[PDB]
């Protein structure tokens, strides 16, 4: 039989956490299920309303001399009237009738989208990118104008982006390996024939690199509020909800760009062997595998280039240049340096260190929970893949079927 | 392994000098005995070290300025430059508090193009521009009309002339050689013999063939093109030069005592020499060399032999024999070797690169390059003086001592920065002393950290001098050199090194 | 995003089998949804008021059929297609000669070989007009022009589909403060189970 | 080889909390990276440094410390007082320029010139372990009140004026302001190119044959024998290698009075005088192992093509035919063998470092005068650093305006020697097939070149290629009792394979005890 997945019993209910008025439970997935047994779709954690039993402790403190916006971020008073929306709400400046004291001294300036989206969240499972936890619209009232490099335009660098350098690189790698044999020899004799070809090409284009600031960084209101909502008590399902919303890591630096890839493989071969030992062997194969990938750039150019690459047609370099420029309009995070999301838990927040340690534990849980480690071995050395609440196996060898049961 | 990384070795420290009565400091230093090479470990940068002192004694550094003193910079400027309308100070201290400003130049003025680069001193030995040594933004009034085309320029005070003496010289040489040789030989022999007659028959046969085909083809191309373009002549005034603030300060801080390391740091920061005349220009050079050879070889041999007899009386007896033997040996060899080098100086990155492309330019991009060279020229010819000729009593106290210190240090520097110290590269690579470590610059078609990789089976090794021997005693003070550092003969050796293989001088 | 892939695989053996697929993916973009403080529609909260606090399996089925058994908490929008065309190798070798006879049409034709031409086609997402025009060419054994592919792709934005999802059960969306919210979630869990147990081939 | 097995990432326990630093109210601690996940493997959930809030139970005064010179509140930046009200905010708080109603303190109108575009990268720190930029080391924007300017030799930009009929060059770009930390910035147009191309080919071919026929009559016998061989060999080899190096400017950083970045300044003020590897390793991580003090700005293009082909064929035959009569009879008997093999490899690498995604891609594809010229134009607007000298980060401290930092500098040296030991890519496993090992954070990869695949690049698609070895790292220092301490290393990670070269470094390294 295949196996429909299995989950533990519920944990005992927590106590009622005050202020958030709720109790929580947890339930691990014992076995993911496999071979088209039913998914574990069911939620890993549960929560329930509770009438709080004891006094709540407030989340607010008086920041003191710093202003305290509607959104709860506090900003140093030089940012009063500054007109940069330093709180994301304009309570930095909506108060002010006059003397806006604006930075950038009436100079031409723009917002850069690459800087705005810098510092994507990442879920280690699948390496999928997520919205940046960084505000990237707070400027600390500095100007710090930088040039787009690919364009004569100046953009104001946001405070959290310590560097965003358009150190452009373009590469192309191509390899062809091509091989033929014919052999016609114990008392063996042969008629072995082979016709083999590997062609492999990839071209990375790097538009630029950002580095996020290591200190004094300002986070979005919703992220810090979701840390506020985060239970102090290590309720695994709530920390998993947080990690699901923001990922387990953030890119503390990233390279933005685009990529094309093409693999062509052929193996045509046959064997005959005859003779006597001290023999009636025959076999034939053909394998013929084409894969093409394009990442980044605008659709309209990207897909035309992917086609002209799949065709043997000689590429008009105008098309390649068009896609490579369009990478500036729609870059991909082709590389990044990860740091754990809990390093973004702001210090001096209430129980900040506890929430950090609990997030580190929740990440340990998240990795080990959705790890194929606790999943059934493939039958014939195929790779087991935890797809989504189920394992399936795929073989690179000639074995076949969802468990490699056959060939 | 053929290579071994040689780590950087610097000397044991000097003795301390005496404490500077004003600078209140004493200095120690080390010589670099051997640069790092081949990823050998670098030295500590601190070949210089410094200790503080008490003010044991006064010093008379307080050079009297009769002029105005530019309060923040301490530059001494003539009072006629107060309220001049121009920052002849560094800090506008000449223009503050002025009741009325007498703007001398109402006109729109440009600076001469690239004139600031010529104000920076060169390391002559490395031909490298270094920090600024002369202030080409000081005008001392000026406001004489100077024009190039319709644009008018403010000549710096330090400059005697910058003048558009415009000239161009082109050279094209192309030498194509072909030879081919062909030699076919054929040899054929046939013999037959018979007797016939109871009856008897006898036959003998022989055939021999030998065939030879040898062919060789050789093709050679040498193409060289060079353009030397000249777009202005520059001359610095010979006297009363205005030094740059940074150079001025760095000279002031020089210890009166000879302590080589500080003067070495001076040279490292600003070089050894400054430019008194230069020609500004552009250079384009293109050099293509190609050799192509083919060989074809063929030897063929065939033999037949027959011996055949029949004897009859019916009844018959007989013996008959035949051999055929055949051999073919064939070879083809084909080779091409190609080198291209393109060098470009002056112009703009677009024209620089389109000239750097492997093809000869269209005359349009040559025109565009030469037009751009006016605005961003290189220095084609230079005449220089050693930097100590700037240390002048009008600027520095004790100036004769500082000057003589520099005179010695410049010799020690020329010795120390000499690339003779590096181990030779393979592959005719050129070792360049580049800081405390040495980089083999490899001709393309040789590669790696020592130029140890090449696919060419042989490559002429050009000579390299070793370091010249130390000064011999008086009665003919003398030095010697041995061409040892890379002996030319290997791999169809290249030219021997230049002389003087020994050099001799007054004591 | 713009992630586009294509794979063409042909595979044969004898000692025999023949198999062949073509896939493409056009991955337009990614959404992730908030887990907490979800703002549910007024109809949805009314339909949680319309759920008896006791396990009336029929009415909870009416709910599960109306809104869903699951929602997509994250997923990748775009388009996809796959084509397959499997050959009789024996006849293949003599109606045609070899794959280059046909590959030359992709990257001059013979009338007899049509088993390679009568492709089975699957397409998902995309504004239908362009996919229909693709089908109208492929049905004639004509590999569609790059123009039609890019037309379809630039259609995809007008009518995408979820390439991939992670579903979570609707009972998570039950607003925690709703009156008796928890028992109603548990009833939804039973109703989900009854949905599976009832409507399944085992029956 | 098959792949090595995975290894799990492992970290030590937390070190004991550092006593709460009075001005910070922060506690710090570190772990050690006992093992990166060389292959597959669970990544560690946690970072190797951690900090927490505290209360010091003691005040600190340091806000007042420098106040002979103007010290900002936000930052330790302490300014010569003529920079106060100078007209240019010299610390990010602007406290030097607020309330400056005595505007007469302004130094000069210089803001008509922008900073040198692309000067900020020279300000960044550098990590030798990853060849990545760190946080800023130099202040990229502090001018020290100087208006020192650099002539932009490429300022000429065409304009057209339809209200006239003039095509003319605009002048906005003509000069840049030079930041204080550059001793030199020097525009200069150079290009060099080198090309080498070579072909060698050989075809060698031999045939040899004998037929021997003998006939006799007494009844009769006739016999014929044959031996024959064909043996053909072909080699084809092509190599070409192009290098093009445009230089557009050179820079040199000032060797004295270096004004550190605000962030580096604060972080260096936070480090203890007492050695604490956690702190100093965090500092080296954030600001990099190295900082830059030389420059070339430019573009590079590189192209390599290698093709190698071979063919070998041979055929052999030996035969006998016989006939005889006494009834007449005929026999024959023999053998023939034949073989053919053919090989080709074509490998091309093209790379552009330079000034636009568009034409960097175009020039990576199709080397031509069109792509060369358009990329050269793009190098006008976005040059890239093509060469840089660097020195270890601690040598910056010797030269700061902060004066002496001997103890902190020696701490940072010790910490750097440990950091360069602990995070070395040695701990990423054997990257086979000339794959490149990389260590990032607590994790390892191999970057596998196209001829190689798998978690260690272990499965080349061909049967094998000549692959050179690489060293494991140096072992621990010996527990020295004599005056000498010793460290050993071997070329086994991987060993030289399929006839590949030995790695060239040293086997033995030695230190004073």
From Swiss-Prot, chain A:
InterPro entries: Growth_fac_rcpt_cys_sf (IPR009030), LDL_receptor-like_sf (IPR036055), LDLR_class-A_CS (IPR023415), LDrepeatLR_classA_rpt (IPR002172), MAC_perforin (IPR001862), MACPF (IPR020864), MACPF_CS (IPR020863), TSP1_rpt (IPR000884). Glycans are attached at residues 10, 13, 280. Membrane attack complex (MAC) assembly is inhibited by CD59, thereby protecting self-cells from damage during complement activation. CD59 acts by preventing incorporation of the multiple copies of C9 required for complete formation of the osmolytic pore. MAC assembly is also inhibited by clusterin (CLU) chaperones that inhibit polymerization of C9. Specifically inhibited by the antibody aE11, thereby inhibiting MAC assembly. Thrombin cleaves factor C9 to produce C9a and C9b. Phosphorylation sites are present in the extracellular medium. It is a multi-pass membrane protein. Belongs to the complement C6/C7/C8/C9 family. This is Complement component C9. The gene is C9.
UniProtKB/Swiss-Prot annotation, chain B:
Heterotrimer of 3 chains: alpha (C8A), beta (C8B) and gamma (C8G); the alpha and gamma chains are disulfide bonded. Component of the membrane attack complex (MAC), composed of complement C5b, C6, C7, C8A, C8B, C8G and multiple copies of the pore-forming subunit C9. It comes from the Eukaryota. GO terms for cellular component: extracellular exosome; extracellular region; extracellular space; extracellular vesicle; membrane; membrane attack complex; plasma membrane. Glycans are attached at residues 13, 16, 44, 186, 468, 471. The keyword Nucleus does not apply. It comes from Homo sapiens. Keywords: Complement alternate pathway, Complement pathway, Cytolysis, Disulfide bond, EGF-like domain, Glycoprotein, Immunity, Innate immunity, Membrane, Membrane attack complex, Phosphoprotein, Repeat, Secreted, Signal, Target cell membrane, Target membrane, Transmembrane, Transmembrane beta strand. Gene3D superfamilies: Low-density Lipoprotein Receptor, Thrombospondin type-1 (TSP1) repeat. The modification Phosphothreonine is found at residue 335. InterPro entries: C8A_B_C6_EGF-like (IPR048831), LDL_receptor-like_sf (IPR036055), LDLR_class-A_CS (IPR023415), LDrepeatLR_classA_rpt (IPR002172), MAC_perforin (IPR001862), MACPF (IPR020864), MACPF_CS (IPR020863), TSP1_rpt (IPR000884). Residues 63-100 form the LDL-receptor class A domain. The keyword Zinc does not apply. The chain crosses the membrane at residues 309-313. Pfam families: EGF_C8A_B_C6, Ldl_recept_a, MACPF, TSP_1. Residues 422-452 form the EGF-like domain. It is found in: Secreted; Target cell membrane. Belongs to the complement C6/C7/C8/C9 family. GO terms for molecular function: protein-containing complex binding. Residues 101-421 form the MACPF domain. This is Complement component C8 beta chain.
Swiss-Prot record, chain C:
Glycans are attached at residue 109. The chain crosses the membrane at residues 99-106. It comes from the Eukaryota. This is Complement component C9b. The chain holds residues 205 to 509 of 559 of the full protein.
Swiss-Prot record, chain D:
Glycans are attached at residues 14, 366, 471, 474, 477. GO terms for biological process: complement activation; complement activation, alternative pathway; complement activation, classical pathway; immune response; killing of cells of another organism; positive regulation of immune response. Changing residue 63 to K: In allele C8A*B. The lineage of its organism: Eukaryota, Metazoa, Chordata, Craniata, Vertebrata. One of its GO terms (cellular component) is membrane. Residues 64-102 form the LDL-receptor class A domain. The record marks 13 as: Not glycosylated. This is Complement component C8 alpha chain.
